[PDB]
Amino acid sequence: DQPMEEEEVETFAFQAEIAQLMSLIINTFYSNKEIFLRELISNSSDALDKIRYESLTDPSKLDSGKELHINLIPNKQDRTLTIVDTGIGMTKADLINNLGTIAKSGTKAFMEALQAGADISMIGQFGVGFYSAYLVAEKVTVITKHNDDEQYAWESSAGGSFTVRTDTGEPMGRGTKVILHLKEDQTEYLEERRIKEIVKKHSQFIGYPITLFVEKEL
């Protein structure tokens, strides 16, 4: 009897600054936790900008999907909140390297301000907003599909490492799917009215459709 499928699973250490940052986020109390959703949507919007732009000179880039949008899917039953976009997606290298974005040089000073007791809200200004996910999530999975590349799954419960592997789950056309497995004490971010108010307050100037799908298995 032979395997249905095989693959390598690789485990990586986070770069030092990012590991320190994740530790600060997880072990320090902050009031303004809701900004995590702002930061993920902003990431999605940047990814959509990137594919929109490239498609200008290469329309075939959109064969994997023409619609550019952001979907929010709370699933109380699984205690997950998923953010899905149809942006440019990430290569394996992009996932490894801070999820497709360059951590800014001021990140060091940012963390020092944090250890001095600064707020977390500016985190997205330094190219590391993604990690605000861990203000509300105990585990995060990222599924991503970039043109002319395989679908990958990234995952970390923090602790200083993440894994990357080709994803053999359900296929995405193109883009990035962020699945937050929420902490017991942060399930409010599964509530559709709470999500609506957060989008309203922090994501007014996102120039793509943002659509809430409240999921309930029957």
Ligand X SMILES: O=C(c1ccc(O)cc1O)N1Cc2ccccc2C1
Query: By three-state DSSP, how is residue 55 classified?
Result: helix
Cβ closest to ligand X, residue 111 vs residue 175: 175
- 43 is known to lie in a ligand binding site: yes
Please say whether the dihedral angle defined by the alpha carbons of residues 23, 176, 84 and 77, taken in this order, is positive or negative: negative
**Pick from 217, 186, 211: nearest CA to 70:** 211
Question: Annotation-wise, does 126 bind a ligand?
Answer: no
End-to-end CA distance of the chain: give it in Å, rounded. 37
Strand order in the sheet with 210-212: 10-13, 161-166, 152-156, 137-145, 175-182, 80-85, 70-75, 210-212
Tell me, by CB under 6 A, how many residues bind ligand X.
Answer: 18
Tell me which residues in 64-83 interact with ligand X (CB under 6 A). none
By CB under 6 A, name the one of 40, 103, 143, 180 that touches ligand X. Answer: 40
Question: Cα torsion at 10, 13, 17, 18 (round to 10°)?
Answer: 50
| Shortest spacing between CB 60 and ligand X, in angstroms | 18
Q: Which two tokens stand for residue 172?
A: 């995405």
Q: Closer to ligand X by CB, 130 or 162: give it.
A: 130
User: Of 37-45, 111-119, 181-189, 197-205, which segment contacts ligand X by CB under 6 A?
Assistant: 37-45
How many CB atoms are located within 10 Å of the residue 104 CB?
A: 13
Q: Which stretch binds ligand X (CB under 6 A): 56-64, 96-104, 166-174, 208-216?
A: 96-104
Considering only residues 107, 176, 186, 203, which one is a binding residue for ligand X as defined by CB under 6 A?
Answer: 176
**Tally of helices (H runs) and strands (E runs) in the chain:** 5, 8
- The 46-65 site mask, x for binding ligand X (CB under 6 A), equals xx--x---------------
Task: Measure the CA–CA gap between 64 and 134, rounded to whole angstroms.
Answer: 31
Nearer to ligand X, 130 or 134 (CB): 130
Q: Which is nearer to ligand X, 127 or 160 (CB)?
A: 127
Is 104 a known ligand-binding residue?
Answer: yes
Q: For residues 113 and 212, which CB has a smaller minimum distance to ligand X in the complex?
A: 212
Residues lying near ligand X in the complex (CB under 6 A) are found at 40, 43-44, 46-47, 50, 85, 87-90, 99-101, 130, 144, 176, 178
